[PDB]
């Protein structure tokens, strides 16, 4: 019955991107969206059970940004080995023809936590009803990221998860198709 509670407060430079979350055995309790300044609970049922002050998290990210600038000067501007993001395309439940599912693109084992993920249905971009989870941490400190595409399964459509990461010379193109 051992459990771990973690707090991820990463900030990248130069990208002007930072996040905040609470990690409970890998899963995410919530995440403070900097843009909306809101405590976005991973499950809304948690908001009816607990609470959090979002403005406090933004103070940390400002401090995290400051430390990174301090570390950058002290580290003589050393770069980061851009690990290739091993990508696996899965579904939340066994794909059921014409039964809504959430394709899950597992952008795994990568750094820095800034990636370009685009869902391609029949080769064309999909930007309507497509969600993504905040960059989730791992034991060896390589980020995870899930992209959710609520879709009505069909054999006519072939989905893709284009994953553009600086560690990849060529863009990754993982594929999914209805076969069950």
């Amino acid at each position: 019955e051992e459990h771990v509670i973690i707090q991820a407060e990463f900030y990248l430079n130069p990208d002007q991107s930072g996040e905040f979350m609470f990690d409970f055995d890998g899963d995410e309790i919530f995440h403070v969206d900097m843009a909306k300044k809101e405590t976005v609970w991973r499950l809304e049922e948690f908001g009816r059970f607990a609470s959090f002050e979002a403005q406090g998290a933004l103070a940390n990210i400002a401090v995290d940004k400051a430390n990174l600038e301090i570390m950058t000067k002290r580290s003589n501007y050393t770069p980061i080995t851009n690990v290739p993001p091993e990508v696996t395309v899965l579904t939340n439940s066994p794909v059921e023809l014409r039964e809504p599912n959430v394709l899950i693109c597992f952008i795994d084992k990568f750094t820095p936590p800034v990636v370009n993920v685009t869902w391609l249905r029949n080769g064309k971009p999909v930007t309507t009803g497509v969600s993504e989870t905040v960059f989730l941490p791992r034991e060896d400190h390589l980020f995870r990221k899930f992209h959710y595409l609520p879709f009505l399964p069909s054999t006519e459509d072939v989905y893709d998860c284009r994953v553009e990461h600086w560690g990849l010379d060529e863009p990754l193109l993982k594929h999914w198709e209805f076969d069950a």
Binding site: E2, I5, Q7, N13, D27, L43, A50, S75, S93, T133
Partner: protein, 188 residues
């Protein structure tokens, strides 16, 4: 494509058997490498790599910072455990189970059995197969707990067999959410 810099703190809270013994591992990792590893088990402020050595010294220089970190073992980890227990530690969602045949190679008839345990929490599943009420072995080739990110897990344990409409092909699931082992059967 420019050089990057990443600063991700990892304030870990390890408690065993509820809150009988709480371990507060304070990790500040820089570019996938640690800088300081303030731990409650050690108590003293340490540093893993040579880069984080100055960071530890500054933080242990002030006694107030030491007290804040040392008091965090029960103020941070222990208090949060009670707050987050109701919907995370006590969270017991039902392990939906489906069993379907599959083919190891394309253009070939089905020769695999996948006991799909999708949509459960927490991740302490167990899978065991049966044939005509008799347990089958040598089929524990599992794909591992594939996290779905929506506070749910997923696992596809595969056992190789050839359907012949003569067996029952019973899989089983043992999870904390259900007091009785969840069974499932499939016949061709």
């Amino acid at each position: 494509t420019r050089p990057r810099f990443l600063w991700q703190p990892k304030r870990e809270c390890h408690f065993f058997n509820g809150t009988e013994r709480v371990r507060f591992l304070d990790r500040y990792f820089y570019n996938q490498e640690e800088s300081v590893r303030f731990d409650s088990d050690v108590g003293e402020f340490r540093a893993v790599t040579e880069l984080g050595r100055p960071d530890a010294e500054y933080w242990n220089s002030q006694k107030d910072i030491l007290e804040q970190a040392r008091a965090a073992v029960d103020t941070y980890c222990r208090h949060n455990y009670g707050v987050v227990e109701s919907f995370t530690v006590q969270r017991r969602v039902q392990p939906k189970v489906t069993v379907y045949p599959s083919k190891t190679q394309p253009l070939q008839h089905h020769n695999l059995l996948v006991c799909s345990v999708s949509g459960f929490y927490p991740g302490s599943i167990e899978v065991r197969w049966f044939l005509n009420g008799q347990e089958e072995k040598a089929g524990m080739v599992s794909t591992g707990l594939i996290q779905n990110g929506d506070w749910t897990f997923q696992t596809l344990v595969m056992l190789e067999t050839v359907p012949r409409s003569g067996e029952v092909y019973t899989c089983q699931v043992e999870h904390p959410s259900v007091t009785s082992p969840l069974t499932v059967e499939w016949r061709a």
